[PDB]
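Re: the multi-chain job from yesterday

Posting the exact lines I submitted so nobody has to dig through the queue logs.
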Amino acid sequence: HHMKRILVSLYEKEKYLDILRELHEKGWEIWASSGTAKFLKSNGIEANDVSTITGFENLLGGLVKTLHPEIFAGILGPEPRWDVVFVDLYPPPDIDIGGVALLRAAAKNWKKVKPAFDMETLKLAIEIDDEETRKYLAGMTFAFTSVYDSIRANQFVEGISLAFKREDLQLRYGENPHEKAFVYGKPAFEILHEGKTISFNNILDAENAWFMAKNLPRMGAVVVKHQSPCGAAIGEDKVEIVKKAIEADDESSFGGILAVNFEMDEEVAKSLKKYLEVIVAPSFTQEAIEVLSKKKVRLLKPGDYASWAGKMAFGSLVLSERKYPEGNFELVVGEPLSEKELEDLEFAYRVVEGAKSNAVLIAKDGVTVGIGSGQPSRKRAAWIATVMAGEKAKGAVAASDAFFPFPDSLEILAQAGVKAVVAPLGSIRDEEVIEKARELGITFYKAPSRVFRH
Amino acid sequence: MKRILVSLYEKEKYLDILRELHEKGWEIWASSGTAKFLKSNGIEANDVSTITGFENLLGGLVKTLHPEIFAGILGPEPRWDVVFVDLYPPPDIDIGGVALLRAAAKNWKKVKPAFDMETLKLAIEIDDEETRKYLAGMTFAFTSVYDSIRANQFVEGISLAFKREDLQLRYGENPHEKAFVYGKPAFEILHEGKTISFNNILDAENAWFMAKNLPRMGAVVVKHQSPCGAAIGEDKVEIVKKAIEADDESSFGGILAVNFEMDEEVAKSLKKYLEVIVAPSFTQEAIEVLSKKKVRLLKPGDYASWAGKMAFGSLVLSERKYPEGNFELVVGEPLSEKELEDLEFAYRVVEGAKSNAVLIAKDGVTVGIGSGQPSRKRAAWIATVMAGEKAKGAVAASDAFFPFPDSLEILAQAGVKAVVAPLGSIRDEEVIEKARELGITFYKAPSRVFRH
Ligand SMILES: [K+]
Ligand SMILES: [K+]
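And the result, structure tokens for all chains:
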């Protein structure tokens, strides 16, 4: 035959047995291993042995039988033997030499041969013949082999390599309308609202909202705006928790992004009185999905994944683990808080971890009451927190995401009526800050590590 | 032992080291092209054609893809202790050489792969298991990046790949978090002692983006990855002073970027404690003065900036572009040539401010910045509080449209005379009419500049 010729090299025969039957039934002439040729022929499907077209060698029990000149010339020449080259590789930690080389050869000779390495690319390769799609298949193959080899590299030296293939989420633009977006790797979420439109900014808002909500020590809810929390609550009553988080900074929460750490149900969904742009939860009842999707809320259900701080800078991807620090708080000065109040303090540090730095936050009775974030100085963060809290600061507790560099931020908080603060230590003026705490009668707890989050 | 298989593109680059190996008693085998090159330079080499059936299919394209060669690499008793392959540069796509290299790496306990001078020099010396494992990882890291480059030749942006780079970072964003840097960064650090931190690098990136395309000589000071102060003008010493003093309390520990050469005079003028200074170049006298301080000196090269982050295990990126298009006067009296310069300066700086951001500037310097806010009204409020009396007669920029007239009213009440912002609110009509009512001049920006 001079057309519809396919060379196959398969590790998983039984996956692809129904497909190869169809192919041969649709006039495809199949070439394969001496072994696979037999299987198929036993399975009633006619197939040709590539061994017949190259010299025979018995080196290393068959390890190099693909690595022959006639096979590669049959792919790389201007008049190739095969129109499609399909290779299904062993999974990690196996390292394949010949199969990978077959795929790359086919992609190299993309104007004459179509490579395929999975079900979707096989289907395209079988159907399509246009230049634009041939280039796409070639691109896809080298994208696949790049990722394949990154995985193998990391098997030898952990973290030596990073590699992704572009994913289509159908983003209309990036951060702003005049900017293009590129998403790399499949995201660990399901989109549950009708039509599934999602934006670049939605995804980054939802990441922070979700990290924080997952990071909450009990039933809780976080509202994000512009990638920083504007409100958060914890409690036992889901409808009330959500009401509290939303109303904490009521002016900002319109169009906000809500993440909860419990299943979103019909009662909670119907209780919403504020348009929210995105809702994120571990699960949604079907009834909740209907109510919310009908209200143009976008809905994300995350799976398990690791979060990372950092960005591209100077053409490098500069990444950091994102961790809420382990370690007990340590009373430094003042009367100890009651257990109830210490839980407010822990809650406050968990929320301030997610707040954009410099951040200072004030909370009481399981809800935030004033957040200052995104500030170039610690004193400014404290000031904004107190302004937003007003009289709600009286008797409240506060958290700072880094150490107080000077006593002034502490005076701002105490004058507002804050009774206790948590922060890391580490300043050259720690003694002076602690003495100011003592003077003002505010209780000071040392946090185990800083939680900058830019 | 001491057997090496060599396939070279950059022949002259490795001639000297190959001579050394042969003088040190290595037995050299080579691709036939490499084999004759070495011979014409007086180096004995064994042509691998010797151990395989001769063919010249497609004029030599497949000479390497022969079972005897791969069996000699992959078996438990290999023919070669080192496999050295240097690949053709882009846009060429290598099949046989990449396969040789990957085969050597696969059989890492028995064969040592190399692909450049660095890895060759290790492969020649070492035999320990840890170092053999490192050579294999390096090789697959290399072939991953090679193939990424090739993918993107076919479909732009379909692939992203990097090798890990050592920047000597002690930790990431906070001391209890690990840092990973991917790809060689387009900067040089000039400073003996303390290194640049994870946070310092991100601060410096925003400072530089903002300074680099100012409409004239300019300086930007950043704290916590957002501008705290900026200035443009005609006198380098004066520009830096103004930028530093604009929010003088916050500039302590700042990251200063200038779009001009850092010289002795400017260097001597700096009194404020700074973490980093970014400049396109530094004179030697400037480096001498500044080396008395702890401050890190960063000299950037050329590269593309990107917004975005990891989210849900995906890398989610956006272009970062200051938007092209002239501002359009919507209502009020047109500004003077000078004030319009102030207005563009203000929009360039608010592009780099964390959203929601509003800023006020006058006579080429920022006077108040409200940034990282959950609402636009709050941003405007902080900007005006910070500016105080300096907002009278000033200009303002907003990184996104005013959703209600209230934000515009806060600025007018402080004495701001003109604003630049995108339009696009359902209440654009009310916003514009409020600007008209208040006698504030409104220029429409071509596009939004959120920057979170
Ligand atoms: K934080
Ligand atoms: K901005």
